[PDB]
Amino acid sequence: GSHMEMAGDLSAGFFMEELNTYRQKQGVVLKYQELPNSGPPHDRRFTFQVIIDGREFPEGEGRSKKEAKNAAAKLAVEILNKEKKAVSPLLLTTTNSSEGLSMGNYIGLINRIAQKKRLTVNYEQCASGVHGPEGFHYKCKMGQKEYSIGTGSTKQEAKQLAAKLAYLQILSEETGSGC
């Protein structure tokens, strides 16, 4: 950790004025402590201590000189430097995140279960516009042996229900083991 041999401030700071910089970007607080000469092995080195916010307890040594204040302030920067590694699992467990609502389409997922459990997926339709107030009759087949024929009030109400009819049918289709 030794390096500078010309540091030692006497007006303002130095690596501290730098440390004091990012600490303001995180909204933390610089709290310096001091426990000089404590090494039992007659090693009267300088063991300083310094926190960043109010929950950590980092520290370092540099002997009796700037190396102490610099080591304490220097190693503090090495803190944010690190912590950049991921430590949480994969996805989070929040009950919100993006909007759920699952898929909103339907004619699309029907073609999905088709190639999934290999089946047929097509849609035909015969609008019943005889007098007018009559309605719209649609016809569609899905599965491998079922004709999802469906009728709707509007050409659009039909299509969506067209899938729903067969789609909700594959769910009810308990046949698919080999008979």
Experimental method of this PDB entry: NMR
Q: Is 38 exposed, middle or buried (0-12, 13-18, 19+ CB in 10 A)?
A: exposed
DSSP β-bridge partners for residue 149: 139
**Domain assignment present for 175:** yes
- Indicate whether 98 belongs to any domain: no
Q: Residue 62: which domain range?
A: 1-85
| One domain for residues 70 and 116 | no
C-alpha closest to that of 69 among 138, 8, 117, 111: 8
Task: Residue 81: give its domain's CATH number.
Answer: 3.30.160.20
Alpha-carbon gap, residue 84 to 95, rounded angstroms? 26
- In 3D space, the residue among 169, 97, 143, 18 whose CA is nearest the CA of residue 161 turns out to be 169
